[PDB]
Amino acid sequence: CSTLSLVRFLELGLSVACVCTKFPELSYVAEGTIQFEVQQPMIARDGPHPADQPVHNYMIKRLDRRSLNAAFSIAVEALGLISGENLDGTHISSAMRLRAIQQLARNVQAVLDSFERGTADQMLRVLMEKAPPLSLLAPFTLYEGRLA
Amino acid sequence: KFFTPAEAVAKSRGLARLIADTGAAASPTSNGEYQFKRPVGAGELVEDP
Amino acid sequence: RAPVTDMGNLPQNLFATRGAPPMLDADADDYLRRTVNAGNRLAPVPVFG
Amino acid sequence: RPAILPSGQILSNIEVHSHRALFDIFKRFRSDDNNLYGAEFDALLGTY
Amino acid sequence: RPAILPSGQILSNIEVHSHRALFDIFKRFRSDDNNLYGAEFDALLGTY
Amino acid sequence: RARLIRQVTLADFCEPQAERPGLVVLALRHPADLAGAAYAATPPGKNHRDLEEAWLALDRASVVSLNFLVAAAENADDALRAHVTTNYRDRRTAARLERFATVLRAMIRSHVFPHRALHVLGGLLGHVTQDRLASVTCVARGDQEAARTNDMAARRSQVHVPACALMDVDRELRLGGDDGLRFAYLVFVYTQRHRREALRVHVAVSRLPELGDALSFLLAGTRVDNAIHGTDEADAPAAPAAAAAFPAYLFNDPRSARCPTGRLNTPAAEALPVWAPDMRGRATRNSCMYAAYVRLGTVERVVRRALPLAHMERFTWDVGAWEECFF
Amino acid sequence: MEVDIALPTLSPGDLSALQRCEGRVVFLETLRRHATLREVALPCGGDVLAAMAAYRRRFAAVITRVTPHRMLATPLGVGGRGQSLVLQNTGPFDLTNGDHVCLVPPLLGDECLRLTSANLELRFPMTLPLAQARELTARVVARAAETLQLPPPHRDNAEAATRSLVLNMIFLLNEGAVILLSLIPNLLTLGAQDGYANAVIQLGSATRELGQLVRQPPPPLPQDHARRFCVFEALEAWIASASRLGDTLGTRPVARVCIFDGPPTVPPGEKAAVVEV
Amino acid sequence: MEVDIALPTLSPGDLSALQRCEGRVVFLETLRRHATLREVALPCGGDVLAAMAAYRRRFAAVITRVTPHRMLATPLGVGGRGQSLVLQNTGPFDLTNGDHVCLVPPLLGDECLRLTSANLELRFPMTLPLAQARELTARVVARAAETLRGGAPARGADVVFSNGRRYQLPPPHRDNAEAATRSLVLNMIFLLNEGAVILLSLIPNLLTLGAQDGYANAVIQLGSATRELGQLVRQPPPPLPQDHARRFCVFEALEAWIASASRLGDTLGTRPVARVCIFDGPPTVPPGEKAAVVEV
């Protein structure tokens, strides 16, 4: 019989990519937003060019919602053995009950572990969707402030 | 995608937007034995400069 | 990695499309379709829709 | 999303459905509508 | 029919459906099928 | 508790983010077999490939919300057209509504009636959507509010029907009755005049377990003008021959020409009278079809309140089989 | 849901007789939770055809308990198909296990728990198996058609029955139906080489009286005898009609009998479990 | 209310075949918690009409899990709250989600288990969606009828579609289709002709009205109120003294026809027995594969 190697998300090295907070009320939340404000610097350039005043701006960002779901079944005659409605006051049925409990336990440990690899995959899925190719970024940050 | 400007009709908020659009586009082609128009349901990521 | 697609040749066949007014003589159109489909790949399969 | 605590009680005892003219919006449910319970809210999560 | 007490654990996991050729019988059920929980035996009561 | 159905599909006809839960959804047949059965079903004289074309002009997509279908019929209040048009997110939507109208008008013309093309599911409650691909979920039995929606503002729901189409019957027929528990019927109204025809939809509630005569009187004008203009384009022959009169005077005639059993061949069978029942162009049953209905469930109350709507009250989903209304 | 029927004050001479009606069915008109006894009540026997036409317009209800104040009921079918209840038989033929039952108005009258104190009378409908209820409806409607243990018709509603019947029959005549009508002699000749073929044809068949008296010519080819085929359409239409001809004159079978332990056949006047449909 | 069936032990190999039919339906006799396999058995070459008539005097029940000792069934008629249950589709063509199934005998070429060790046969009825079944019955009957008059034996249009794929409607001679269906086509065609004849005998001048202005007017007047064009049914001639060998009382014939038509209409199914409410699966179940169903 084979074992199942568990993986803990925060044990991996990928966890430094995203800050994660538990939030047991997320299902209640409608469109949620986060804000931003930044102040650019300025240099007092001498000459006929109109000396520009310090600029201010106000930027926000909108949340996006996803989900994760995994499903596992259970056998119909196994239900009569877990519950006891089909249990007999005998010496065999205890063995079948032990076997069915073991099966349900292995199965639920399998599925309850799947949500770790799930997040470890979701992180790569989102991190791959924003990152522009380096070929089109290395020279772009070299022509800053001139695209007018 | 060379004679259709309806995509070019979509204005560019800035060169950075068109940059980000590359490297994350959706695949228009299928994954079958031939190159067929793809059912828009599934989709996948593909880069094209 | 190795190219997931082939890089060979496969000429398209426009007789798998719509929107074109067929020519008047029906015999001419049937002859064109029967000569273009002379073992050419992928164009027809006589099943509706 | 009804009121949580009232400020002052009311004294007049009068049929209100016949007097819907004076009010702006007027909603009468029968008995324990299952709608006045669920509460959703909007939220702002950190400012940088 | 299934095992009761495993003897040795397996060190290395692998995709099993690839290597069907190495095995002689092969059965892969989705999850918790119905056959595993049948305890139906048969035997001789007495001899003479 | 109640039982649910989940059917992944395309977001063309029922658009579960545009409407809120609580409105009946319908299942649309695969169109291939409709187009096929037309080839043998369209009556004589009429076109026999026009449904083929009408379908090809609208190019799987399986569900259709009643809120959408009611708009693509004759009867509708333009407020709901405006709502469906400006409130649906989707591209090219008004054009699609037009094409669907042409489809249904072709369906009735080809004598393959839409009631043989739209089975009814329950009221939707939930959905998860990709880009132009949805998975709606509707009840199928039990009462609506046994479900649990993931809105978190209103966990339970109700059933919403466009009040423009809801036609009450009892207060209409003046039965003098007293509102208790009433049934709920979704009814279709056909009308057949070649190249000038349409379809009317309604949602009917009453205590009447058997519609029958009730609709036969309700839709009297439709049946009247449908029985006479329905046989059109069918070549009827000239004045019927007098031989068509089936002779009845000859049954209990003691003295009459008679034939030995088993000899309808060449031997002396000539002296028998000839009778040619010849029926070519008269009104068949499919010619006098005017309405079709199907039972939906049971209802307590209907209140009207807002676009006008009609909230149900303790709807218990119990779907029945279709029914013809021709006589 | 449990319909509650209230009772006025009753003399002990008839309360004890009402107690014995614990498994019979009555016909309300509206399904409110409460209803007085006076409401659910039918006049004394008359025009079994009219009554049978009235059972269609109202949904039944069987009663279970009879208290000195209150008398319960159960709306038979509005949302349920497995509410196993018990109702007593009151029809002459004993209904056996397996088959459905249909409600039929009573014959000859004489079944009226005439309550004098309340000044009203009830007529509980009898319960017959399907196979015989169909035949009874057949006999009564045919007798009504004759007038252009047995009560006479009324000539005011018998015409309605005749109208329904003649409509359901008229719409059988199709340009495909004549094609079938053409092989009556080819059918009779087939009903001669074999035994079962002759067995299916009746004795006063009303068609053998025709196939041996009139010759008909080959049928005229209908318009477009290449694209479509008519016999199929006519036969499909006839199936659709005949599947719903029995109920349109009588009443749909309302419940089927299931018994788990008792003897299979239950005699008249004895209660027997049931499940509704 | 779950019944079990004693199983007279057959053999290896065959018991696997019995295990493969873990989804079909079987028609019990009475609701007892015990039954012998010999009871639920029918000669798999049989008359379709009589089998379809017998399907009414029984109870449907689906075969849940089986074991060498016994097999468990669950009736469909009686039940509590209409619990879910699994069903193996066995018709000729698939069935979609959200419709009604009906039980008809193996009208076309038959399949039947031949348990050669126990020396008994089993018939497992087809599972068809409602409208498709009501039309397939008419299809087979109409083909037999067209054959009957010796006309053009083929028209290339005895085909039925279902979800795109074209079905062929196997040739009508495979097992006994020329013998196990004769009863049905005879008993249907005959009744149709008799109804037509009775109607025409009651209204002799029906087919001599206006080809487009008289017949339609008569039908619309009949559907509407009591005008009826007088006694639209002319008074039939007076009968014979009921010992003359040629007596014909039309009204008794109409009575017999009403009775026989009602009986035939009831012994045809077409009243749904279940409804597919599949959930968490492929929305279209192909033949041979199980499908979640809730009883009606």
The radius of gyration over CA of chain A amounts to 28 Å
Multimeric state of these chains? part of a larger assembly
By DSSP (H or I, 4+ residues per run), the number of helices of chain A equals: 2
Share in helix of chain F: 10-25%
The topology string of helices and strands of chain F comes to: EEHHEHHHEEEEHEEHHHEEEEE
Using the alpha-carbon principal axes, give the shape of chain A. Answer: elongated
What is the global morphology of chain F? elongated
Q: State which percent range the strand residues of chain A make up.
A: 5-15%
Approximately how much helix is present in the residues of chain A? Answer: 25-40%
Order of helices and strands of chain A: EEHH
Number of alpha- plus pi-helical segments of chain F: 9
Biggest sheet features of chain F: 7 strands, mixed
Radius of gyration of chain F over all CA atoms, rounded: 25 Å
Indicate the structural class of chain A.
Answer: alpha+beta
Number of strands of chain A: 2
- Identify the biggest protein-protein contact and residues per side: G-H, 70 and 78 residues
How would you classify the helix and strand content of chain F by structural class? alpha+beta
Q: Largest beta sheet of chain A: what is the strand line-up? A: 1-2
The largest β sheet of chain A comes out as: 2 strands, antiparallel
- List how many beta strands of chain F DSSP finds: 14
Task: Tell me briefly what this model is.
The PDB classes it as virus. The structure is cut from a larger assembly and holds 5 copies of chain A, 1 copy of chain F (327 residues) and 2 copies of chain G. With 327 residues, chain F is α+β, with helices and mostly antiparallel strands.
If you had to describe this structure to a student in words, what would you say it looks like?
Chain B: This is Major capsid protein. Chain H: Keywords: Capsid protein, Host nucleus, Virion. Chain H: One of its GO terms (molecular function) is structural molecule activity. Chain H: InterPro entries: Herpes_capsid_2 (IPR002690). This is part of a larger assembly, with five copies of chain A, one copy of chain F (327 residues) and two copies of chain G. Chain A has 148 residues and is an alpha+beta fold. Helices cover 31% and strands 9% of the residues of chain A. The longest helix of chain A has 38 residues, at 93-130. Chain A is elongated and about 100 Å long. In chain F, strands 6, 7, 8, 9, 10, 13 and 14 form a seven-stranded mixed β-sheet that branches. A five-stranded antiparallel β-sheet of chain F has the order 1-5-4-2-3. In chain F, strands 11-12 form a two-stranded antiparallel sheet. In chain F, helix 2 runs antiparallel to helix 5 (93-109). The D-F interface holds D 34-35, 37-40 and F 145, 151-156.
